[PDB]
C-alpha cells in the first residue's frame, strides 16, 4: 500500500470518504452536557481513540473526506500538514491526560500509531496501543520495548537495524536481539498483553466513549461494544457515521476538540498545556476527585 514502506497491498481499506455530519449548535451543547453527566455518574470510564483526534494536529485520518485511504482509493497522493516528530498533542490528547489524573478515566485504548498519547504525558500503564507506535521498537528475543524521540524507521514488524542493549538477569551481558518496529500491517496479530488489558478494561467499563474512529477495524472497533453487552453505556463522538452507530446510547457529530473543551468546562477541569515530549511509564498517584459539577442552565 505504501510502496517504499513495504506494507501489504492486499488490505481491505473499508468504507472511505463518507460525508461528515455536524450536529446543530443547540443540539451539540445539550449532548455534551449529557456526556458530562455520564462521565461524572459513571465509575469505570474507558476511552477509545482513533485517527480523528490527531487531525487538528495536522495528521490526516484514514477514511475521512481527505483521508489517506480515501485519497489512495481515488488515485491521489495523501496530504500531510506536519511530520510525526513535530506533531503536537491536541486539546483532546491533553484533556485525556487530565481526566486520568483525576480518576475520571480508567483506561485508554487507541488505534493510533502517531505516538501522541505517549508524548502528551499519558501514563503507558493505562494505555493499550493496539496497532503500534511509530516511536516504539521492541526486541524479538526478550520483548523489551524502547520508546524513542524519533520514529524508529520501519513498519510491518520489520527489523530496524538496531540491537537490544539490556544486560541480562543472570550473567548481565547484552541481549543483542533484533529490534523491530511495532506497527501492525494488515492482518498481523495484535499485541497479546495490550489487547487483553484493553478487553478487560472494556468488559468491566460502565461507560465506553469513542473519539475519532469509524470503528471499521476489528478487534479494536468492537471493544466499545463489550461495554454495552454487560449493561454499560456507549457514546460515539465522530464527524462521519461509524459502523456501530445503531448501538450508541448517545451519538455526537462534532469536532472532538470542541466536545472535549466543553466537556472539561462542565466538569470544572482545566486542560493542561503541553511542555514537550514527556514519557511517563506509570500513572502518578491519583489527584482527588474534583468538586461535584453544576447542572445545565
Amino acid at each position: 500500500v505504501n510502496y517504499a514502506a513495504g506494507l501489504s497491498p492486499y488490505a481491505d481499506k473499508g468504507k472511505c470518504g463518507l460525508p461528515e455530519i455536524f450536529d446543530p449548535p443547540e443540539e451539540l451543547e445539550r449532548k455534551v452536557w449529557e456526556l458530562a453527566r455520564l462521565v461524572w455518574q459513571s465509575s469505570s470510564v474507558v476511552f477509545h481513540t482513533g485517527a480523528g483526534i490527531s487531525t487538528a494536529s495536522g495528521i490526516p485520518d484514514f477514511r475521512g473526506p481527505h483521508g489517506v485511504w480515501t485519497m489512495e482509493e481515488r488515485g491521489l497522493a495523501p496530504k500531510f500538514d506536519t511530520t510525526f516528530e513535530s506533531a503536537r498533542p491536541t486539546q483532546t490528547h491533553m484533556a485525556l491526560v487530565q481526566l486520568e489524573r483525576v480518576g475520571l478515566l480508567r483506561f485508554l485504548v487507541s488505534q493510533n500509531v502517531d505516538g501522541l498519547h505517549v508524548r502528551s504525558g499519558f501514563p503507558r500503564d493505562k494505555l493499550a496501543e493496539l496497532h503500534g507506535n511509530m516511536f516504539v521498537e521492541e526486541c524479538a528475543k526478550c520483548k523489551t520495548q524502547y520508546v524513542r524521540d524519533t520514529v524508529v524507521g520501519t513498519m510491518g514488524l520489520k527489523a530496524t537495524g538496531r540491537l537490544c542493549t539490556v544486560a541480562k538477569a543472570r550473567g548481565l551481558r547484552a541481549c543483542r536481539g533484533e529490534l523491530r518496529d511495532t506497527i501492525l500491517d494488515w492482518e498481523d496479530s495484535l499485541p497479546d498483553r495490550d489487547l487483553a488489558l484493553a478487553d478487560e478494561a472494556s468488559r468491566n467499563a460502565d461507560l465506553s466513549i469513542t473519539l475519532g474512529t469509524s470503528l471499521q477495524i476489528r478487534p479494536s472497533g468492537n471493544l466499545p461494544l463489550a461495554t454495552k453487552r454487560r449493561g454499560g453505556r456507549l457514546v460515539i463522538v465522530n464527524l462521519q457515521p461509524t459502523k456501530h452507530d445503531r448501538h450508541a446510547d448517545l451519538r455526537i457529530h462534532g469536532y472532538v476538540d470542541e466536545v472535549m473543551t466543553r466537556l472539561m468546562k462542565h466538569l470544572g477541569l482545566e486542560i493542561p498545556a503541553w511542555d514537550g515530549p514527556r514519557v511517563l511509564e506509570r500513572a502518578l498517584p491519583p489527584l482527588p476527585r474534583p468538586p461535584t459539577p453544576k447542572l445545565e442552565p
Binding site: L184, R218, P219
Partner: peptide
C-alpha cells in the same frame, strides 16, 4: 491471537 482486519 486476534488479527487486525475489517473481518468480512
Amino acid at each position: 491471537t486476534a488479527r487486525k482486519s475489517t473481518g468480512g
